[PDB]
Amino acid sequence: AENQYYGTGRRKSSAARVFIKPGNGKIVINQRSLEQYFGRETARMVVRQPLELVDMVEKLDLYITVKGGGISGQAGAIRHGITRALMEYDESLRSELRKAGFVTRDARQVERKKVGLRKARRRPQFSKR
Amino acid sequence: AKQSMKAREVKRVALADKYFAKRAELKAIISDVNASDEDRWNAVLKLQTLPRDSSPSRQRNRCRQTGRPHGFLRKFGLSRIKVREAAMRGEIPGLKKASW
């Protein structure tokens, strides 16, 4: 229970901070417009897909601040950032969002560059004879 | 091994202090851009032969422990093989196996 509810939306080493409240449907992303940051991009349809899905695009007002990651990925982190914050609209809510896959953090985690190998696993290439 | 790389390391420190201390900013003052219509006189830059061995360009050091050439590391005063040898017996502070 909170004044304006909050999600952390951590995905693939990016953290989307996302404060949701009641309003008229508006967006602020990294203190600018949707148009500015994700101008004529598929990234614009990403952040919009979970707000269309639980049918509240035109009813949630939003403030978003986001760090780390790649721009197409930050939209992806926002997709969890919105869904983190919604949990109490209904009791089944996080469960159904995880089933649609848009809570789900990308469970694959880094492997470090290894010693004597040219990448994480690539052992050196030699023909030597 | 060689005594010549140990002899070098000892010779540089009296000669760093002797040639170099007077000469510190002297390359910049008499030659470079700070000499804009000032100095630019050969007779005050013919003096950089003396600091030649005492140069930042010869502080390649190599090992202090053994005097052993090639593959050096300033942070130990050592090389690849000799780091690993001290590390095996736990002689280097903070040093552990890496995992991540």
Binding site: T42, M45, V46, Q49, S72, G101 | -
Partner: protein, 178 residues
């Protein structure tokens, strides 16, 4: 080798349409890891298709992926002094991926001023079954109809199933000679 059968990672319906057939496609469209570029190209192709016929944006895309499809692959498994070949049936996941790969192999040399136009246009061709991978589907079936004579280590293998207290018919299972 290999004690048991292991599965595979799964690719997930695209964020702009909700399609598995798009999500498998974007993956064989990937160049130098750059899947978000191959996304703009896939979806910009689909709007160009929708301009040839507005009745579905996915219409010619989906049927191209039926019409250019390989069902079969050719394997080699020695018989004595000679290797020969045995066709084997391909799994749906690779049937789809071979067929999409071939549409995109052709589309990237087509010389139109954008991969979105090139690709949409090579779906127009392969949609009617007149294009570049119609011959490639036919050639792959020609090998499977021609090579129906040979089998995998054929002279010893025919004894081996009946002798290992296996059946009187070729056992598709580990530790029978195959």
């Amino acid at each position: 080798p290999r004690r048991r059968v292991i599965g595979q990672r799964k690719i997930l319906p695209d964020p702009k349409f909700g399609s598995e057939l798009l999500a498998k496609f974007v993956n064989i469209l990937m160049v130098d890891g750059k899947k978000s570029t191959a996304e703009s190209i896939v979806y910009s192709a689909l709007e160009t298709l929708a301009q040839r016929s507005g009745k579905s944006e996915l219409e010619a895309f989906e049927v191209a992926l039926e019409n250019v499809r390989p069902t079969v692959e050719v394997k080699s498994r020695r018989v004595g002094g000679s290797t020969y070949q045995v066709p084997v049936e391909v799994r749906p996941v690779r049937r789809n991926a071979l067929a999409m790969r071939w549409i995109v192999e052709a589309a990237r040399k087509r010389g139109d001023k954008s991969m979105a136009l090139r690709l949409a246009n090579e779906l127009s061709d392969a949609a009617e079954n007149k294009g570049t991978a119609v011959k490639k589907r036919e050639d792959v079936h020609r090998m499977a109809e021609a090579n129906k004579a040979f089998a995998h280590y054929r002279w010893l293998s025919l004894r081996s199933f009946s002798h290992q207290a296996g059946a009187s018919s070729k056992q598709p299972a580990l530790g029978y000679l195959n």
